[PDB]
Design a protein around this motif. Structure first.
Motif, PDB file in Angstrom:
ATOM      1  N   UNK A 225      -8.682   8.762   8.018  1.00  0.00           N
ATOM      2  CA  UNK A 225      -9.318   8.314   6.768  1.00  0.00           C
ATOM      3  C   UNK A 225      -8.401   7.631   5.731  1.00  0.00           C
ATOM      4  N   UNK A 226      -7.586   6.652   6.154  1.00  0.00           N
ATOM      5  CA  UNK A 226      -6.762   5.796   5.255  1.00  0.00           C
ATOM      6  C   UNK A 226      -7.320   4.380   5.315  1.00  0.00           C
ATOM      7  N   UNK A 227      -7.772   3.784   4.182  1.00  0.00           N
ATOM      8  CA  UNK A 227      -7.781   2.324   4.041  1.00  0.00           C
ATOM      9  C   UNK A 227      -6.427   1.676   4.411  1.00  0.00           C
ATOM     10  N   UNK A 228      -6.476   0.461   4.982  1.00  0.00           N
ATOM     11  CA  UNK A 228      -5.338  -0.327   5.541  1.00  0.00           C
ATOM     12  C   UNK A 228      -4.614   0.451   6.661  1.00  0.00           C
TER      13      UNK A 228
ATOM     14  N   UNK B  94       0.874  -1.208   0.000  1.00  0.00           N
ATOM     15  CA  UNK B  94       0.000   0.000   0.000  1.00  0.00           C
ATOM     16  C   UNK B  94       0.903   1.248   0.000  1.00  0.00           C
TER      17      UNK B  94
ATOM     18  N   UNK C 223      -3.186   5.381   0.411  1.00  0.00           N
ATOM     19  CA  UNK C 223      -4.456   4.898   1.037  1.00  0.00           C
ATOM     20  C   UNK C 223      -5.305   4.149   0.001  1.00  0.00           C
ATOM     21  N   UNK C 224      -5.403   4.736  -1.191  1.00  0.00           N
ATOM     22  CA  UNK C 224      -5.992   4.127  -2.408  1.00  0.00           C
ATOM     23  C   UNK C 224      -4.931   3.240  -3.083  1.00  0.00           C
TER      24      UNK C 224
END
Lengths: 53, 142
Positions: B115-118, A42, A45-46
């Protein structure tokens, strides 16, 4: 690299990549497997940071 | 007492410049009840002091006091709690302040939302907790 993947900016990425390449002359491969640990899984974040990579 | 009175303060005004004056001077109190008296007079001034005198001298006056409530959104747990709960009725009785009030809250969310995925704890639970001299209080109940 961290600022580049946060902003989704390729110019700073190109600077960093070619800087480790000149630092090598398998330091490239060392830094690349270092990326594969908790950077390249990763980048941002995207997961479009992999698509920009 | 004040739900009763407020029909006055739509008509009379000198009394309304006595009121927000009193609620404000209570916000900066010793007694814990006075902070919450402030919230309650303010939450009700924001509720039934217009749906949206002139509309422009109410839509501004609600955004004036609501800025003085971002101090209260900073103040201790209980006094915050009363704002999370009373603002739903402010919204029902005053619809047009929705947009402003949303940003008033959503700021207060992001102080504890990451607000971060993973990142696997998506919320910051340990910043809701004030530890000083082994008095460990929740303030900002998430």
């Amino acid at each position: 690299m961290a600022q580049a993947f946060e902003s989704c900016q390729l110019d700073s990425m190109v600077t960093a990549f070619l800087v480790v390449r000149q630092a090598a002359l398998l330091s490239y491969a060392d830094w690349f497997k270092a990326s594969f640990g908790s950077t390249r899984g990763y980048h941002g974040c995207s997961k479009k940071a992999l698509v920009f990579l | 007492l004040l739900k009763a009175v407020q029909p006055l303060l739509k008509v009379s005004m000198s009394m309304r410049d006595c009121l927000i004056l009193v609620l404000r001077k209570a916000m900066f109190a010793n007694q814990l009840d006075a902070r919450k008296s402030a919230v309650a007079g303010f939450l009700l001034l924001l509720k039934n002091f217009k749906v949206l005198y002139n509309s422009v001298a109410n839509e501004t006056f609600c955004l004036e006091i609501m800025d003085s409530l971002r101090r209260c959104l900073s103040q201790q747990a209980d006094v915050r709690l009363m704002l999370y709960e009373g603002f739903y009725d402010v919204l029902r009785r005053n619809s047009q302040l929705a947009n402003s009030v949303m940003q008033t809250l959503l700021s207060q969310l992001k102080q504890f939302y990451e607000p971060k995925p993973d990142l696997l704890p998506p919320l910051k639970l340990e910043a809701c907790i004030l530890t000083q001299g082994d008095k460990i209080s929740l303030q900002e109940p998430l």
